[PDB]
Amino acid sequence: MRECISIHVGQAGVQIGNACWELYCLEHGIQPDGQMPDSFNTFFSETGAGKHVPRAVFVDLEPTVIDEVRTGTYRQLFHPEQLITGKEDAANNYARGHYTIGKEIIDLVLDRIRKLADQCTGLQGFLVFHSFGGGTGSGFTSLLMERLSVDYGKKSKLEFSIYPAPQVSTAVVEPYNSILTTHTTLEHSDCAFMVDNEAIYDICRRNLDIERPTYTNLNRLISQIVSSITASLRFDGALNVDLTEFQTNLVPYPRIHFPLATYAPVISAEKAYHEQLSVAEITNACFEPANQMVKCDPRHGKYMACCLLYRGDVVPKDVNAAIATIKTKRSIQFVDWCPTGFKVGINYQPPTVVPGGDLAKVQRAVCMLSNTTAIAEAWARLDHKFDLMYAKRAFVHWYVGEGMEEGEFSEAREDMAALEKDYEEVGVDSVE
Amino acid sequence: MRECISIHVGQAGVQIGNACWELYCLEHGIQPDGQMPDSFNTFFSETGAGKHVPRAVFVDLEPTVIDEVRTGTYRQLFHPEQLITGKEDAANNYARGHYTIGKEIIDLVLDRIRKLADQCTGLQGFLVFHSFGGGTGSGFTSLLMERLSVDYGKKSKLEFSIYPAPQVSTAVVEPYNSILTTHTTLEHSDCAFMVDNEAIYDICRRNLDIERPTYTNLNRLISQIVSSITASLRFDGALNVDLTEFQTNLVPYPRIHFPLATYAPVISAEKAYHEQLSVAEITNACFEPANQMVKCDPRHGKYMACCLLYRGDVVPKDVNAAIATIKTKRSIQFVDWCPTGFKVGINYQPPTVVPGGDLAKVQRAVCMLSNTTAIAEAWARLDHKFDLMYAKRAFVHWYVGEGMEEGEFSEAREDMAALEKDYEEVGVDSVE
Amino acid sequence: MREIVHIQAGQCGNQIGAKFWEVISDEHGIDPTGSYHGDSDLQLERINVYYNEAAGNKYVPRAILVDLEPGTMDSVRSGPFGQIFRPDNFVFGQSGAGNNWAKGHYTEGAELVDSVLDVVRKESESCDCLQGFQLTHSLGGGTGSGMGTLLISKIREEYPDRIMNTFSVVPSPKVSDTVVEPYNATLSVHQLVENTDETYCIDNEALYDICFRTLKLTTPTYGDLNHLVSATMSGVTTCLRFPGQLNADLRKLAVNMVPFPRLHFFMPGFAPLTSRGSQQYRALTVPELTQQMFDAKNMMAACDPRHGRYLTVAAVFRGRMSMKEVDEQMLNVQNKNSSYFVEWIPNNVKTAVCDIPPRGLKMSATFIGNSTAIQELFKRISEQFTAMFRRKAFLHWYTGEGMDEMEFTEAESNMNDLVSEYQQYQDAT
Ligand SMILES: Nc1nc2c(ncn2[C@@H]2O[C@H](COP(=O)(O)OP(=O)(O)OP(=O)(O)O)[C@@H](O)[C@H]2O)c(=O)[nH]1
């Protein structure tokens, strides 16, 4: 009787979420029209008849990407009071995400969310899926993160936010929308998981043998992380894990809430043979730096606390043997004050494959969550992008001219300089 | 539970190895698709289903000879993460084998090798199959021999390296690739077995009655040596032998690790009748100088230590009678300090024949290993080839112009002059 | 992988490719339209080396054609397999060479080369991994002499690691196509040794007698003489393009064939050669192929290997043949012809074995020779050079186009410094 609702903000909210909700339909026997010709009380409420609905709140400031759900295959699944759209988009502008357009319908989305909580009692937490590059995924999220701490507060919020790639840039204003949303969400959020685009193109060429993927093909692997963190809620496992536990097991200091995600194995269907995928083979592939979904090499940093999620055929003696070999290595080095840095979860059911997909039906799979310290090197280079673009006063008139005090950049940058050297404080060891 | 992985370097690595792995498929009931419609834990790991894979690491700098495995009969047997290729070949250049091209993927092959050791516990040793004439079999081997002593070290490495023929030359740069790889592998290797081309054409015309063989037909006899040294691991015998024992039974001095191989009987199928192949008839054929696979007459030298491997119907009283008649002869003369120069091994199972092959299914066969001293006469004539080609400064600009100090020839040649007269020290007897 | 960009230059350098690309496309079953019609899947295993795979399952030759006049480029497209080329690659000047090395290297060559070096660069990124460039031209004319070498010096600055080989046409000894061919030779031979890794010298005068004394052709036209040029070039790269028991490429045939970086003038040979009325009486065995190569009347250059010694010998074989039938024959021709080789290089025979024979035969070979018999080929050029230059004959045309005497004097002695190397290594011990 434990429920968890999800919020999808911006275009990155929609196109991730459709591939995510496609996977939830294929697990609990859900057709594309809701019927099932239990256990899914978590993510699917029931009507008076035998039809179920998803607990989704899709929101965007532009109407194109929403209407593909309104006319697509999942037409008659979603309640049309939940596809909240608008007239004009923010269009890569934090002022039009947080100060001009986002001021209007921030009091419209909060009506539908509270009506979802009225038919639930085990409301554990939220799921906020957005991006950092775009304005709507940054601006409209940052105003939304205030009102959720006002109304609910105790419910453990999460973020599968798209981290901006260090060498693959789509929008020019990524060093402004990344920094300005960081000053806001640091006051409200609980645990922000990072998934980057550039490392997925590294994996899907090398480990799926596909040199030409699409965003629909990239969203198939992102749904593996979503189903494997929420695996202990829907299915029952031998050793479960709660959404309240993630902000305790992985957040040492309240000003640092940036872990990252890693999924394994990722092999193609014609390569799905020729190996057994033993539990130690699929766990050393996790801590390998070449298989992460964020292009940040962790061997130049340390791990404060790690998390291991297992689903499939999992023997707990085998997991115990798998962890102890890793801690006897040297390429992985933890922080000196945390010897007990693992939260191990085990679920029975294997991850299923989408028909017409790209990965293969395997017996077991791992989704690793780790809270590194080497990600701060990417934060310096992100700030190195911010130093040149702001000292030249580039692109400022698009922000100040739309309801934003220019001194607010002085507030966000100095807080960024604090968190830049907060990893210097934690990353060093103690004295003797 | 004792395993042993193999490495195949260069074109001579591939075309030997395919005929070798063909023989291992035909013994343990392995189809060309891995199924078997135990004992093969040594060379064949098992997947989660009922399919097995070979423990092969095939590597070459040119993509032609690899793709014939990728499209040939053994297509669906080998894991495609093990057929490591490259763009450009070394193409008879030790600089492009060890300093220019081999620097790139030396850190790529070592990833797959350690993953084979992660699913093994009885890792005894290695098998490195290459040649001395070509650049890739010399250069890429010589850099690989450093990293194996760095990482593993204790595991007994071996070489079935192709010795360059004294009177049959394919490449012009054989007196450079033979000498420069000898300065490197002397520091790292443990036991290098020599098989020469010229003596096999002497045998296969005279003893198989085939005057026109091919490299595929020459690789059938080389696989007899491979299965008969690794015979005590796969099958069980009345008196077994280990791969750690070969570097103790046959290496008196650490600077001399050159034995040679001899196989008997080698008779055709229409000649397979008319004789019984008694154990003394098939053992005097071993020590006969006309039946060796290296064209070096041992009667102009001595034997430091010999080894005898037997497979088939073998009675230990018959082997004892067979050895004592040989030591009472004069054409074989041992070195004065080693009366106990035999390591005798007995396995029960006879060698099987490949369908469409050339030899015949016999009851018993012998693979003789001996560590002669007359091979140094071939080393002088190899250095006699090196003296003229280097004093005229021939072909030097192809080496110095591709990242090689010219003074490195002064280091390899003076070490060669040491090992040339190290056989003078051992080959003479003591004083009184 | 390992793609080769083909570049042509000169009136001779264009019509060879019309014969050359007809042969290569027929080794893979290609119509003059550009589609595929082959039966075996081996023909598309290494098809990308001479072909960029275009849309519509078509194939174009990775080839760039260069002239200084439009008198040849329109003649290629109006013949067989002239439709296969892309119309953008025909880069050519408008006026004409005038058969002048000075105009072929300084006057018009400074203009047209920028319209070529981007097209080569456009084919540079088209290659997934570049192997090397091959060039087809002459040494007597104007366009093939200068404009060819003007490309070579710019390419070697762009690509020092990439190999380079020119199937040039050395002029005949006695009969003369070009009046000023000693000036066009020496001023181009000075440029070849600077920036080329190897060169395959082909004489016209030998190829007349090969078609007459051996093939017994009554009317040998250039549709038959240039066919033997294509049989050489296809016989070199035939191991790079197909699986064989012992592979070979343009790098193995460059390292094992060049002992010293300026001694890289070669001589090709082809075997077998059967007449239409003399083919049904020959035993097609591998030792028949060997003794046919090593005589005077099968060399493709006016050279006398009896008066000279070989240094390096490469033989590239095609077809399903054994090795003892090859390797024993390669040893025996060294033993009986022991004076015909050099002493300080032991066992100088290079073996290359492929598995795809030429279409129309069962077994074949291709001979690559390197001997000191070419010192007569250059001194006879240098003898004609010093006779004409001391009279200042034909010198004002070159001098009128910005050229000094020190350009000649350095180029004269550098050929004399070339031949004095060959005579030094000829009879040493
Ligand atoms: N992995 C992945 N990334 C996506 C997907 N769709 C968009 N992105 C990324 O999202 C970023 C663009 O941000 P958007 O979400 O489209 O922008 P926005 O916040 O909606 O702002 P507007 O311009 O107002 O719509 C780029 O980095 C895209 O690569 C998707 O399906 N998968």
Ligand SMILES: Nc1nc2c(ncn2[C@@H]2O[C@H](COP(=O)(O)OP(=O)(O)OP(=O)(O)O)[C@@H](O)[C@H]2O)c(=O)[nH]1
């Ligand atoms: N017995 C035997 N010898 C072989 C075989 N294949 C090649 N060789 C020998 O190997 C030598 C040539 O060396 P390669 O291994 O081809 O050269 P490489 O090291 O790969 O160097 P590259 O030119 O860069 O490919 C010659 O002596 C051949 O006779 C084979 O199947 N059997």
Ligand SMILES: Nc1nc2c(ncn2[C@@H]2O[C@H](COP(=O)(O)OP(=O)(O)O)[C@@H](O)[C@H]2O)c(=O)[nH]1
């Ligand atoms: N093999 C061959 N050589 C030719 C042919 N036509 C001309 N040549 C030779 O090419 C040289 C003249 O070069 P040419 O192409 O006319 O001058 P260019 O156009 O300025 O390069 C002479 O050595 C001729 O013998 C031909 O069809 N075949």
